[PDB]
Structure 1
Amino acid sequence: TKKKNEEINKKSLEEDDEFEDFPIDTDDVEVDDDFTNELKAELDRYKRENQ
């Protein structure tokens, strides 16, 4: 009954369904950096070489 008290008082802030109102309405980030780097290294190389 301590637990029951918690859930009831809380309800008015939760209203109808602050639980399902919202969904009814609606290095790990960084992309493949291998590709960028591949191309960088060859673009450097080329110039280096013909200089």
Structure 2
Amino acid sequence: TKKKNEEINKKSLEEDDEFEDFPIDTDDVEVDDDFTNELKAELDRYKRENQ
């Protein structure tokens, strides 16, 4: 009950909680590189071999 005064005082300095204001108002990207690699391997190969 002691800590409680402080928790309410902080919230008020924020105003509400923004936390809930936002939803009301509104190499992890790396593509599988296997598909691109397949194309690469094959074009190089064709030329290499028949060179």
* TM-score exceeds 0.5: yes
TM-score (norm. length: structure 1)? 0.73
State the secondary structure of the residue aligned to 1:31.
coil
SS of residue matched to 1:41: helix
Greater RCO (CA < 8 Å, at least 6 residues apart)? 2
Q: Gapped runs of 5+ residues in structure 2?
A: none
Q: Percent same amino acid at aligned positions?
A: 100
Name the Cα RMSD after superposition. 1.7
Unaligned stretches of 5+ in structure 1?
A: none
Aligned residues: 51
| TM-score normalised by length of structure 2 | 0.73
